[PDB]
Amino acid sequence: EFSKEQQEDFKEAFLLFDRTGECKITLSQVGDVLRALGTNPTNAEVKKVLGNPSNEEMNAKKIEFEQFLPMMQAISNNKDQGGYEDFVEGLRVFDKEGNGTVMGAELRHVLATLGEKMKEEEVEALLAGQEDSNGCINYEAFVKHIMS
């Protein structure tokens, strides 16, 4: 069960996203409501037990606040979400020369071509400019920036 403090924090997030004054969040937004609570849910997590519709699709369903409370507790708060240790050894698959350096094109390609594929717009928004001559991107610096 959640604490009173957790319930009110989840509510403070909820009262931003029911923006039309309805007391109800549109179902599409629930993934990003979870992101606003500091959990990092995959779109595969989001469409299953969290009950989300298609990606970027509005109108289909809405969620009351009390309905949202088990949809925080039993979902991303009931699973592994990955740590630093995951990302470092997943990136080391693409570390050809062992120096902590990956090409910016290769890192963009992993984000856009593999997994739950990223838009170029998403990739550029998160890029902190850390590209040298052909010294390329320190991938550990990218992971620490994305996990702060």
Added chain:
Amino acid sequence: MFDQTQIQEFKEAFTVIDQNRDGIIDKEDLRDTFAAMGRLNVKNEELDAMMKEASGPINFTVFLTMFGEKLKGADPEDVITGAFKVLDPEGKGTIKKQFLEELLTTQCDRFSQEEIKNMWAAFPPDVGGNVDYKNICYVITHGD
């Protein structure tokens, strides 16, 4: 929120029409104002209908009160320009049609389908689907 800029702007608009008995806009004053305005919109019922929006005798103080509807939004010059700027990443050529249509229709204080038609009939656009924000800002206050 009726600013000194706005009321002085309204004061000259009153004063150009004026010249009638000590500071009152009347029927004749409006009729001969139209003569220098290039358009024969001087039809008697319509002209005298514009008096019904005040209790009587349109002096300058009454003229400001008549414009009470106008102030009910009316965020100042560069604030509307700055508001639109947040939704442009690409720096003039401005807001992509799909994003703007979503922004008004399904985001914030939602536009009705009639409101969307009311705007698309007077919005500036290209042939691909982009919408000029600065030209919309100019249309709000008008200079052509």
